[PDB]
Each structure stands twice: as C-alpha cells, then as structure tokens.
Design a protein around this ligand. Structure first.
Ligand SMILES: C[C@@](O)(C#Cc1ccc2c(c1)N(c1nc(N)ncc1Cl)CC2)c1nccs1
Length: 314
C-alpha cells in the first residue's frame, strides 16, 4: 500500500537511504537503480554507473569463485571498497534481504546495491587481509590455535545469523574474510542464504542437504567444521578418499577420520560434535562456539603468528 508507493519512489533511481529501502527495492529484482547505505558511496543526479561514478581497480583483477569480486573507488568521494557482481537473471533476493540491516563485527558490512543493465552490483567493505581461503593456500595449512580462533569467530557470526533465523548456506574458508592484521574474521557472501522459521560448496554439504531432507541452521555448523578440517589439513574433506562426492556424504560416516591426531582432545571433540550426521545430535552455533572457546583456551590461547612459516598439507 504505502510500501507500493515507497517502492515506486525508489525504482528508476539510485538513492542514499536505509537498509530497509534496499530490501524493498531488491525484492523487485525477481536501467540504473538502487540504494547506497554509506555516506562514502554517493549517487550523482539519480545515477550510479560503472566507469562513470565508480571504477574498478585499474588492471581488472578479481576474487571469488567466478572472479566476480573487485576492488573499487567512488570517483567523487575517493572511497575504496569492494563490489560483487551478480547476474540479474540469477540474482537471489535473499542475498540482499538476509543481509541488509545486519550489524555485527563478525559479518561483512553491506554498503549498498545498484542494478545496472544485466548486473546487480553489490557493494561492501573492502577487507584487506583477504579471505581465509587465500591464507590456507598461502600458508599450506593453519596452526591449531589459529584454526580454532577463526572457527570461533565464524561461529559467533553464525550465532548472530541463526538468532535472526538466517541460514548462511555456504560457510567455508573462501567466505570468511580477514582484517589487514588477521585478528578479525567476518562472514561474507549471502548468495546461498535462506530465511527460516542454488546450493553451497559440495565438499562442505551436510548429509541432510545432500539427501534432500529438511534443513535448518545446523547445516551451517557442519559446513563450518568442514572448513575447520580444511584449515588444519590444507584440503577439503572427502578429497583424499573419494566418483561424485555427494554420494559418499550421504552413505559414509562423517569425515572425523580426517581430524589430525596432533590436535588437542577438545579440538577433536568439537569438530566431532559439529559433524554429527543427524541435525538433532549436531551442536548449535552457540554450543559449538563455547566448546571452541575452551578448546582454544586448552592449547594456551592464540599464540602463533598470522602469517608464520609455511606448513605442508596432508
Ligand atoms: C556481496 C556479498 O554477498 C559478498 C561477497 C563476497 C563473495 C566472495 C568473495 C568476497 C566477497 N571477497 C572479498 N570481499 C570483500 N568485501 N573484501 C575482500 C574480499 Cl577478498 C573475496 C571472495 C556480501 N557479503 C557480506 C556482506 S555483502
């Protein structure tokens, strides 16, 4: 009714506004329009067009699975951030709706979203430490205490999301970004998200996902523990032993055989409680974050350097 009227006032234009206005407009995304949420990205005469009001980094390099994430500059403000390009035809409303208006240290801030032609350009804080995925490739694999430290932070983000009945849907190293000193980790990429009451990465898929069963917040927990194994071992679960990986996840025992023997007992225990095949038996974000918290205390806290020495994968 009035929502109809607000939406009309937003269509056809790029404006500065609040998270709720971006959500409402987003819903119409199944021509240059959208909403910018920070003072640092500013429309000019109803517009925000690539290579006119904003420009991506000089020689076009990119991050993400599809090389779709870029460093960018507002031409007027000079402010630097990041953009994820999503194809309009494939844009999921939920990537913005389950995202806009959140505010947590453990979740990457949304800066706005603008439609231009066949593109939905989603803007966000540029996290300069890169992704946890890049770190793992750089370092070979992570020390136990660093792995726990980041797993806890990811879990705090999941706590925050789960309380709001948002499923992340693709929890993994590649989707955990780091500040420039490595001390702050945050969840990004809500391209797979779903609001509770296009699938994630196959290796990190929970059995109930793979089997087509009913899914809740607990899927994120399983994914996060697969990510933990990725951190410790320097490779995804199921890689070493296995054919289509989605068949083995359903039938086979959880990949707890991949917990390194070197890990401390409570680290091992925690990964096991997050890798229970049945969701009822699997730990919640709150439960697991607490365990992982003491797990990190049990190995003397965070001590190892963020970029220490290389360590060979398994
Ligand atoms: C739009 C969104 O769905 C996203 C995203 C997204 C997806 C993949 C990748 C990134 C980002 N990356 C980075 N992204 C930033 N910002 N800085 C540094 C990096 Cl290395 C690399 C890989 C959002 N996620 C969270 C709030 S909006």
């Amino acid at each position: 009714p009035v929502e109809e009227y607000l939406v009309h006032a937003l269509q056809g234009s790029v404006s500065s506004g609040q998270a709720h206005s971006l959500a409402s407009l987003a819903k119409t995304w199944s021509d240059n329009e959208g909403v910018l949420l920070t003072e640092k990205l500013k429309p000019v005469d109803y517009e925000y067009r690539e290579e006119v009001h904003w420009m991506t980094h000089q020689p076009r390099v990119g991050r993400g699975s599809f090389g779709e994430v870029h460093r960018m500059k507002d031409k007027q403000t000079g402010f630097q951030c990041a953009v994820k390009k999503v194809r309009l035809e494939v844009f999921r409303v939920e990537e913005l709706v389950a995202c806009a208006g959140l505010s947590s240290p453990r979740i990457v801030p949304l800066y706005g979203a603008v439609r231009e032609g066949p593109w939905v350009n989603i803007f966000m804080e540029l996290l300069e430490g890169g992704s946890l995925g890049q770190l793992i490739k750089q370092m070979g694999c992570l020390p136990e205490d660093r792995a726990l430290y980041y797993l806890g932070q990811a879990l705090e983000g999941l706590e925050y999301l789960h309380t709001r009945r948002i499923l992340h849907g693709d929890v993994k190293a590649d989707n955990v970004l780091l500040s420039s000193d490595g001390s702050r980790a945050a969840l990004c990429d809500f391209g797979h998200a779903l609001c509770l009451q296009i699938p994630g990465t196959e290796t990190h898929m929970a059995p109930e996902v793979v089997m087509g069963k009913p899914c809740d917040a607990k899927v994120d927990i399983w994914s996060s523990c697969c990510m933990m194994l990725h951190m410790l071992n320097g490779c995804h679960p199921w890689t070493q032993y296995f054919g289509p990986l989605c068949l083995k996840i359903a039938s086979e025992p959880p990949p707890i055989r991949e917990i390194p023997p070197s890990c401390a007992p409570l680290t091992a225990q925690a990964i096991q409680e997050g890798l229970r095949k049945e969701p009822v038996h699997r730990a919640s974000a709150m439960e697991l974050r607490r365990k992982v918290g003491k797990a990190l205390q049990e190995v003397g806290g965070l001590k190892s350097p963020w970029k220490g020495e290389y360590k060979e994968p398994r």
